[PDB]
């Protein structure tokens, strides 16, 4: 949820969603 | 597939003009309305970026265009909040100077009245408690103390409610 | 017992002068600093009012004076936040006008830079995704897409962090 | 917690603490 595995092993960074959930 | 990406880039370079020099109010969002818009658009952008990567991986072009357009709409409202929030930050600086509009004085009045009512009631609560401390065998004053505590509770609830919107 | 109540009433009528005409910055609290001060002082006042009633009922005068003084300190900071918040509300009104100080422009810059970086990175993300949608068999572009998504995530975290303080 | 029973059956109103907790 805080990252998405793209093809060829690269990662889609979604750590800002983790930052939102920790606040709320 | 290319149209959704072309339109998104055109809308992104247009909404950036708000970020160049934000010294005027962009919209009617408060400082809390700006942050809330940032939080909601961040959740929308997060799932939109997920749909962009997955549908490009899976060759699902229709849902890919939906994710691109959703991301574009999220980024635009994301910057409309940041541009207004940047305006409010510099204007709310103590070393700044501002002429307050009549509609502005009408918006701060619900905060001023609720606070001045709280001091008035809490003062009477302390005045009543001063006598109850000497003589607690005073049923009428316990009713007066309870009455002031009721006005204090209401004035505080109405003060916080006036600030959260 | 009477001194704690007399001093509390003297401090309450002094801090009300801030509520009479708040058209200037009272302190260095932001709009979030004002609400947080209201929330914390409300919890302190709630237990102080509890101690005022119980110790007057139980004849525990020393702890009663402590509750009176605690309530006085809570009410003063409660109004210092409301007075500053009332100033910020009327000044943040869209129909108002304000001259932004250099220290104000230095405080909104971390918000402007983080937002302009996000549009720059999200634009490159859409540009990269536009090619991956046509040809996903592009390992280098998936690395570029991941690189832009990393700058987007950092720019958003630094933007929210710039607004919450 | 949101109210305190005073002598002679009167109540100390602390409903504003309930308003704070519901927010947070």
From Swiss-Prot, chains B, C:
Region Helical bundle R7B, annotated ranges: 98-165
| Localization terms from the record | Cell projection, Ruffle membrane; Cytoplasm, Cytoskeleton; Cell surface; Cell junction, Focal adhesion
Upon changing residue 142 to A, the result is: Impairs the interaction with KANK1
Q: What is the recorded phenotype of mutating residue 46 to L?
A: Does not affect focal adhesion (FA) formation, cell adhesion and spreading. Impairs the interaction with KANK1 and abrogates KANK1 association with FAs
- Spans annotated as Helical bundle R7A: 1-95
| Stated role | High molecular weight cytoskeletal protein concentrated at regions of cell-matrix and cell-cell contacts. Involved in connections of major cytoskeletal structures to the plasma membrane. With KANK1 co-organize the assembly of cortical microtubule stabilizing complexes (CMSCs) positioned to control microtubule-actin crosstalk at focal adhesions (FAs) rims.
Q: What is known of its domains?
A: Consists of an N-terminal FERM domain linked via a short unstructured region to a large flexible C-terminal rod which contains 13 amphipathic helical bundles (R1-R13). The rod begins with a five-helix bundle (R1) followed by three four-helix bundles (R2-R4). These are followed by a series of eight five-helix bundles (R5-R7 and R9-R13) in which the N- and C-termini are positioned at opposite ends of the bundle, creating a linear chain. The four-helix bundle R8 does not disrupt the chain because it is inserted into a loop in the R7 five-helix bundle.
Q: How does it assemble?
A: Part of a complex composed of THSD1, PTK2/FAK1, TLN1 and VCL. Interacts with THSD1; this promotes interaction with PTK2/FAK1 and VCL. Interacts with NRAP and LAYN. Interacts with SYNM. Interacts with ITGB1; the interaction is prevented by competitive binding of ITGB1BP1. Binds with high affinity to VCL and with low affinity to integrins. Interacts with APBB1IP; this inhibits VCL binding. Interacts with PTK2/FAK1. Interacts with PIP5K1C. Interacts with F-actin. Interacts with SVEP1.
UniProt protein name: Talin-1
């Amino acid at each position: 949820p805080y990252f998405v595995e793209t093809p060829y092993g690269y990662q889609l960074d979604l750590d800002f969603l983790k930052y939102v959930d920790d606040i709320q | 597939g290319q149209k959704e990406c072309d339109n998104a880039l055109r809308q992104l370079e247009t909404v950036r003009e708000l970020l160049e020099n934000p010294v005027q109010p962009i919209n009617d969002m408060s400082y809390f309305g700006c942050l809330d818009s940032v939080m909601e658009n961040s959740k929308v952008l997060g799932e939109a970026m997920t749909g962009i990567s997955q549908n490009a991986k899976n060759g699902n072009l229709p849902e890919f265009g939906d994710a691109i357009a959703t991301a574009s709409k999220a980024l635009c409202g994301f910057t409309e909040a940041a541009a207004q929030a940047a305006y409010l930050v510099g204007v709310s600086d103590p070393n700044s100077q501002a002429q307050i509009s009549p509609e502005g004085r009408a918006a701060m009045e619900p905060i001023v009245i609720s606070a001045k009512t709280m001091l008035e009631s809490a003062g009477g609560l302390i005045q009543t408690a001063r006598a109850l401390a000497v003589n607690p065998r005073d049923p009428p004053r316990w009713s007066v103390l309870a009455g002031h505590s009721r006005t204090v509770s209401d004035s505080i609830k109405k003060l916080i409610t006036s600030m959260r919107d």
